[PDB]
Design an enzyme around this catalytic site. Structure first.
Site, PDB file in Angstrom:
ATOM      1  N   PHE A 139     -20.045  84.432  83.825  1.00 44.07           N
ATOM      2  CA  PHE A 139     -18.645  84.350  83.429  1.00 44.07           C
ATOM      3  C   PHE A 139     -18.223  82.887  83.479  1.00 44.07           C
ATOM      4  CE2 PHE A 139     -13.989  85.097  83.927  1.00 44.07           C
ATOM      5  CZ  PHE A 139     -13.799  85.952  82.858  1.00 44.07           C
ATOM      6  N   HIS A 177     -12.567  79.320  84.453  1.00 45.14           N
ATOM      7  CA  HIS A 177     -11.234  79.862  84.236  1.00 45.14           C
ATOM      8  C   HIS A 177     -10.413  79.604  85.483  1.00 45.14           C
ATOM      9  CE1 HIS A 177     -13.275  82.931  86.547  1.00 45.14           C
ATOM     10  NE2 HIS A 177     -12.094  83.415  86.888  1.00 45.14           N
ATOM     11  N   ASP A 217      -7.430  81.799  87.648  1.00 50.91           N
ATOM     12  CA  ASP A 217      -7.052  83.198  87.783  1.00 50.91           C
ATOM     13  C   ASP A 217      -5.627  83.431  87.303  1.00 50.91           C
ATOM     14  OD1 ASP A 217      -9.525  83.737  88.835  1.00 50.91           O
ATOM     15  OD2 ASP A 217      -8.746  84.896  90.532  1.00 50.91           O
ATOM     16  N   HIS A 225     -13.017  77.922  88.407  1.00 49.17           N
ATOM     17  CA  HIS A 225     -14.237  78.453  88.992  1.00 49.17           C
ATOM     18  C   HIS A 225     -14.979  79.281  87.952  1.00 49.17           C
ATOM     19  CE1 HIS A 225     -10.991  81.297  89.522  1.00 49.17           C
ATOM     20  NE2 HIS A 225     -11.876  82.274  89.596  1.00 49.17           N
TER      21      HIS A 225
END
Ligand SMILES: CC(C)[C@@H](NC(=O)[C@H](CS)NC(=O)CCC[C@H](N)C(=O)O)C(=O)O
Ligand SMILES: [Fe+3]
Length: 328
Positions: free
Chosen positions: A208, A211, A213, A267
């Site tokens: 992933f 980004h 959160d 992260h």
């Protein structure tokens, strides 16, 4: 690759009435939020052993028929009301991750936001009780268990920012919170399909991508398999695993309202070929909740940023994250 400083913070004073002890926790939260942005909440009182066991039971026993029956709109056009809540199917050979998301159990057909069809509000879908005995009860009680922990953590953040301890928690309410739980399975696959692996700019293999959160804060339990990295000015750093504590981080709503004093850490999730669980609780406020921004670095504490209604923030953020990092 270096290792992030992720301190373990005993958060138990935030449940108590020792106000000076709370301030000492708040200082630790302040220091971590100004450094890498992550810390581990320990002495939290949640039975994470049962959480990991009930989750593994559900992921390993749910059938393809049940997954279609519970699937969100992205996988099943028949379920137009399931934007957030429901099952997120894996795509063998293409997408390894699968997950089940649920919302506030108080979102029922009686709830006025359901009656009004307000975006981001949905009635949870659940498997057959007899096929998954105790699952729904476990899941709903866990929602309120982590709600209670998150309420205390919000008191720590409020004190850390120079506010009264209910500055955030007063907007975090069981009758209207848009908070969500996601029960994520990352499978072991042999062979692992390269189509399910993304390559970062720096060459790291990822599950992933980077980004921030979409949350006020995120309260995360993961099984004991290291995978997360946080971006720093010196590059991405590994976040060590800890399958007894909760990994806590600020979301972009906190970055907005503090005038970036508490950043939402960027992260990503490294690719690891290992069976593991990722169980985030996204601490979201109510649809109409508005927090007045402020700047703890200014002597007058004044910020020129617009107060943002949380529901509109959540709707935009969840669609943006899908557009940028793919449908999960
Ligand atoms: C980083 C982890 C928390 C986890 N990633 C995630 O949970 C990612 C990034 S924070 N989250 C999302 O895609 C948003 C889920 C929102 C949820 N369906 C809802 O309607 O509220 C992972 O392990 O991949
Ligand atoms: Fe995240």
């Amino acid at each position: 690759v270096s290792k992030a400083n992720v301190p373990k913070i005993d958060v138990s004073p935030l449940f108590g009435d020792d106000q000076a002890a709370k301030m000492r926790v708040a200082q630790q939260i302040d220091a971590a939020s100004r450094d890498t942005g992550f810390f581990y909440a320990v002495n939290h009182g949640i039975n994470v052993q049962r959480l990991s066991q009930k989750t593994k039971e559900f992921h390993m026993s749910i059938t393809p028929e049940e997954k279609w029956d519970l699937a969100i709109r992205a996988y099943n056009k028949e379920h137009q009301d399931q934007v957030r809540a429901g099952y997120y199917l894996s795509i063998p050979g293409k997408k390894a991750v699968e997950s089940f998301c649920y919302l506030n159990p108080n979102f029922t057909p009686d709830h006025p936001r359901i009656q009004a069809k307000t975006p981001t509000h949905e009635v949870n879908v659940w498997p057959d009780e007899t096929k998954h005995p105790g699952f729904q009860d476990f899941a709903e009680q866990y929602y309120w268990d982590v709600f209670g922990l998150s309420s205390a953590l919000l008191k720590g953040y409020a004190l850390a920012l120079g506010k009264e301890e209910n500055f955030f928690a007063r907007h975090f309410k069981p009758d209207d919170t848009l908070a969500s739980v996601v029960l994520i399975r990352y499978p072991y696959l042999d062979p692992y399909p390269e189509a399910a692996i993304k390559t970062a700019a720096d060459g790291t293999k990822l599950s992933f991508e980077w980004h921030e959160d979409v949350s006020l804060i995120t309260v995360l339990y993961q099984s004991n398999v290291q995978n997360l990295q946080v971006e720093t000015a010196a590059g991405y750093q590994d976040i060590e695993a800890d399958d007894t504590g909760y990994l806590i981080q600020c979301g972009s709503y906190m970055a907005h309202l503090t005038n970036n004093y508490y950043k939402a850490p960027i992260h990503r999730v490294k690719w690891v070929n290992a069976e593991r669980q990722s169980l985030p609780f996204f601490v979201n406020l109510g649809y109409d909740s508005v927090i007045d921004p402020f700047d703890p670095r200014e002597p007058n504490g004044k910020s020129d940023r617009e107060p943002l209604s949380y529901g509109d923030y959540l709707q935009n953020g969840l669609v943006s994250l899908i557009n940028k990092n793919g449908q999960t």
